[PDB]
Design a protein around this nucleic acid. Sequence first.
DNA 1: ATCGATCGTTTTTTTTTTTTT
DNA 2: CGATCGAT
Lengths: 625, 620, 185
Amino acid sequence: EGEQFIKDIQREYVDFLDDEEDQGIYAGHVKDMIAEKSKRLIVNVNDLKRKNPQRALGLLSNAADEQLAFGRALKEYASTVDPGYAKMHEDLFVGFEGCFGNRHVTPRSLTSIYLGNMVCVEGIVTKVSLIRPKVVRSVHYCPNTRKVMERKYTDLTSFEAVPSGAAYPTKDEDGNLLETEYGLSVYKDHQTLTIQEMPEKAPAGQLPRSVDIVCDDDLVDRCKPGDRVQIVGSYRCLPGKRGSGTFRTVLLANNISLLSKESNLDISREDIMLCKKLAKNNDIFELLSKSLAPSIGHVKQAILCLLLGGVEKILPNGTRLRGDINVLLGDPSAKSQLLRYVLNTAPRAIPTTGRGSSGVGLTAAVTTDQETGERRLEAGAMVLADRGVVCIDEFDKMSDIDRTAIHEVMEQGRVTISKAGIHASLNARCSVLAAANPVYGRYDQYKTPMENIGLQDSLLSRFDLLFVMLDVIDSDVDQMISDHVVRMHRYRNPKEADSLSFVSSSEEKKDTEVYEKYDALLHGKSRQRHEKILSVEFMRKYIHIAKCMKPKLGEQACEAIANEYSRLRSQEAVETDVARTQPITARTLETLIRLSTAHARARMSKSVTIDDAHAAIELVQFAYF
Amino acid sequence: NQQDAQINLQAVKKKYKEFIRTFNEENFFYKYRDTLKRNYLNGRYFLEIEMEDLVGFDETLADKLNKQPTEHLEIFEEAAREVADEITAPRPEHEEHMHDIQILLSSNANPTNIRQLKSDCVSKLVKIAGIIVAASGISAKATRMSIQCLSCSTVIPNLYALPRKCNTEQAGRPKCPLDPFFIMPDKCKCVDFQTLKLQELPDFVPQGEIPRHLQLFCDRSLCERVVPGNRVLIQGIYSIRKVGKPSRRDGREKAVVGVRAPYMRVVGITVDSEGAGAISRYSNITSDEEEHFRRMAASGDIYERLSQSLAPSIFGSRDIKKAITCMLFGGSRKRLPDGLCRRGDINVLLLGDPGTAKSQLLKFVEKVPIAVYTSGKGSSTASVMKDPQTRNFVMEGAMVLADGGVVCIDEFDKMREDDRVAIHEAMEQQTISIAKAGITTTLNSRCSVLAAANSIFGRWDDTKGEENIDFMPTILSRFDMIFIVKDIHDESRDITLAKHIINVHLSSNKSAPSEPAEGEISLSTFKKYIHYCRTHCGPRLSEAAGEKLKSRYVLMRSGAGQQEKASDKRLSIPITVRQLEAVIRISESLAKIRLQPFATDEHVNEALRLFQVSTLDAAM
Amino acid sequence: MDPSIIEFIGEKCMISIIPNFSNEPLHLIYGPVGPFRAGFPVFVPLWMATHLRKQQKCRIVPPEWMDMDILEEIKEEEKRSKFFTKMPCEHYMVVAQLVMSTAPDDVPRCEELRTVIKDIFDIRESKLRTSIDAFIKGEGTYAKLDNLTLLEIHSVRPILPYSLDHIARYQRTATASQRDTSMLS
DNA sequence: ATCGATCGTTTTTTTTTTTTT
DNA sequence: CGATCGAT
Ligand SMILES: Nc1ncnc2c1ncn2[C@@H]1O[C@H](COP(=O)(O)OP(=O)(O)OP(=O)(O)O)[C@@H](O)[C@H]1O
Ligand SMILES: Nc1ncnc2c1ncn2[C@@H]1O[C@H](COP(=O)(O)OP(=O)(O)OP(=O)(O)O)[C@@H](O)[C@H]1O
Ligand SMILES: Nc1ncnc2c1ncn2[C@@H]1O[C@H](COP(=O)(O)OP(=O)(O)O)[C@@H](O)[C@H]1O
């Protein structure tokens, strides 16, 4: 209880709880009468300015105990309101949250100011780290005297002061009994991590800088390293600085925004209703075909099913199999730019290099005097893509060491792995792509189908189809592709009878003249579509339920798969394609199963049809047919 | 306060305080008050100063300023705030609170060299000129703070001893001794700290040796001031961090007597003007400059004049050079809401008989804003090291140093293929990938590249057919304009080359009668001109250009395929999407030069005739 | 609003000086002019001592507000002058420049003098920024001139008002128009 | 000279990347 | 756990 404005400030927050605003909304049915018990309340400063700006911006310049007082006054309020939750005898800090915009600097720009402030960050989830508990206070006991004293301890990372330094008591009075009662002696949760600039604003003549973060109990580990984030907290700087040796920083006092979900969406059971209304429309698959790659011929009809992970199949204490799909094929010049349609279009999309050691999936766990006693640990580069897909470029240029190290969990669909320190295992059941090249460029068809590629013929069964990709034109199609490519060049740049300018309106405007660069809709509405039915967001809003629905098998599958596999192994190894009939095996069944499983999710028909049979075979024959 | 000399007061008392109020010429500009106030208005908190004003004022300070500058240059700060806070008062009501400021120093005295920065030259102001390598991030530092134990803002001279007594002694006789200090950074401060760096010159004892270098320091406003790979002029000061001679001999087997460490802090860095020594990121350029720029852009005789800017001692290769500089400007990073960030920067190939001045030409293209040169056997896997302090795995990751600049190399042929592939790739997507240790940071940077080479068998391969490259056609892919170099004979050509270079090669010849040519002048100007013209205009096509260019590429591929058929076998280069995707950037470079945004197809018939060199080169 | 337009206003003011002639090749103008006799003061405007001193014709002396103590006390009064202060001739910022160009050939202490005039100029100007820092609710019927001088105010003139019309049109429309429950434009 | 109360006291790690022949 | 340092 420092300078007595603190209590004035307490009651100024009590003065929040007068009428409709807080006596109506914000006090009562807010954490405890709703009983989820998040001691961290939701404040937004703007209402506080609308009562006491001395408490709005007196906070965002100094936060010594205005927070302490806020939590105090709140607990005393609910102590009046509701003694049932009066058993949590702690600070019960609060939010002071918001998507406000006072000062929202980068990790680069927490720059010699803002000390003693409550401000924003954005950046990358990185180094999501290990947990520990923390000390609050100790409920001791003396059987000699039947006396239960108590002792609370602090440190700067929680509030200002420090304990009057000493360890836990022993014979503290004169020699009587000091039985430390635990269970009554309590503990929060603790955590520590860092963030980087989602960097692409970085000047690569310069270094994208780093930050320092601390967290606490009900905030503990709320997303994964590999995601995008915005956060808003307060700031402190403890260490010595030549009174002894220089200075460092830390951040806290905060609530989160992860800004890449779907559950973030205000989801009723209506979005499903829009999907299922339009779901019946049959030739929508072709729309999704022309959807994700609108800027390029060419495939993606199939790539979808990679993009959907797969389907789970387990037996009664028997085995399990991995459900997912994997393919790839091509000389240079749309191959090397069909991979970043995922990095920045769909989630859980983490490309890899083509050149990678000790953490393409390894960790190597090398450690040097961690804050705790972690003798060995790091993480890797696969669980980032658990339950989805992956990109690479320069695959044939990859080492042939770790190719087999792929085959491990790829073909197993399991982890039973370790770096020899502790046996480790889990379920990461992932897919992947990469890129490709014939060792000499323009060759895959004249000389041979195989051996213009030159590698193990073992994988081709691990993958699904031998396939084709080439580039030539005859005398007639050249102007057709010319007009296609020139549609590419114009349906992208804006703005495309004696005098036709000087029209009633012009380019002269206030605030809707050119957003970035405008585009056309002419004759892509002869293609009767819309920018919302054919879009990003309604597309992705139909991601979740096809991943929740589970289209079981019909019955007419069996005779058809039989006849077609029969003819496949009969006469696919003839007619100019024999050396591209090498990998035929008893594996086209399970891929066909993943196929109809996926396609039966693209309209969510928990069922099976012969039309799906055509859909799932015709691509396979179209490989060469 | 021993008021005899070297006193704390006399300087601040009136002298420094009144120097500026007194600093006068009519025109009523000539103070540092106006600059100070108008700097304050925009959050600057500094001002610029000379060191030969004291001669304008007096004859004593300077030979005392050099001696103990560490104090004088803070008396300056105090005098500054007290002489400026009076003006912070519009009346006494709008100094909501004062603030701290940083002074600058400058001169034109002379640059020194690192080989002489010695024990005499210590604690002493100076001037040098080096070059920059890299320097740290932005950590922290402050000046004072309070402690709960005493509740006093702890005031320091040096930028630690923390004595015994408690000061929570008002506990009765039960006091708290043995240093109980609770640092209260609610009450502390915060300034900056960045640790700049310095390499020595390229001509000043590196000869039978290697070049050393030095590390640096800053406080408040000289972070966000220097990006590395730059030429500086400097005023700093040479001082230490630790101290001691006697037999407290250091470490385990260290310090025979007394060796403490070097560094410098800056008091008034500035930059260089090697023509445009420092014109890379900031803008101290003035309206006269921009008028000059646009009025030369207004000049419709600028490009052919610029065909003669790199060859004032070189003859020939003019059709060759109509786009050797168009490389520099870059076109447009016309990105799109999907992935298709269609390729921004531009790339070139050249290869042929030696004796034709490839090396000197690329040295010059380095000369004329940002660039580097190695060639083979080795700028940039990218570099995942492990920090010898704390043993963490940081990424130095050096095409990053072309993050808008360009690159030139020969010696693609003469270096093996373990290191071509990451760079095979970067220059189609500009994203340096990483997946090696526990990091997936897909870095990126916009560099171009220039590619010289050497064909084994020379013009023999070039006479008959397919021995063009020794390595691959997938890097025959990525480049637009590709140039033979021959030295076909002619005696007229021979004699003209003869006297042309001798008149060059005679008595360090062309000082006076060189620049008297038309307008072919000042590569400095080109540094500035380029760093301007790329930094504004974002053009793209006009409608009439598109159809003819489209039909032209059509006929290009048809002729390549017919030569395929006119020989009954493939006689072509691959007619790629990349070829049009690059000639678009040649149009873009042209419009970047003249600054007209919308470019017409007559503007680009020049492009047609220049890549026609590549077409008719790989015509056979 | 200019550097010389106000000298058509300011430079017409008068002092009294000494010439070295008596009445000239002409005697005197039909006008307020005094009789010309050397060795004695004569009252003139100050668009002519300019013409005369540099014509090497005369000496000259200043007014009395051109001093030290007046210009040492006016400032400290002006400190807590919440509104304005003493006004010696009310455009002394133009007289002093056209004074201190030449006359400092023989004027005394023409430097500490300049120091103070700058010291007073800047402060009064800066005050004339913070007057703005209370202007709320369209107070275009309330302002200050009470001991203003003019050489400070023209440094603002074109800026605010050519804006202030459409600025406070939203509220100047209020006491000039009508609408339903909300504020009008 | 003797005893006692004063002063001040701290140490723990193993492994991954690029390079050269 | 060691040495300093004060008085008895
Ligand atoms: N139909 C198309 N769809 C998408 N992009 C195209 C198309 N046609 C041409 N392009 C463009 O042409 C350029 C050709 O380069 P491309 O990315 O194909 O090389 P690459 O596939 O990486 O070569 P490699 O497979 O040998 O690595 C690309 O920038 C691509 O955007
Ligand atoms: N046509 C020319 N006019 C003027 N000087 C020339 C000409 N050709 C060559 N020189 C001079 O000859 C030298 C050529 O050396 P350079 O390093 O260019 O060889 P190169 O042409 O690059 O051969 P390589 O590519 O095999 O190294 C340069 O110093 C250059 O100044
Ligand atoms: N005789 C068989 N019994 C059971 N499964 C078989 C048989 N022949 C082929 N299969 C198929 O082969 C798969 C396992 O084959 P696998 O051992 O992976 O082949 P490979 O030895 O080429 O790796 C099963 O999923 C099943 O679908």
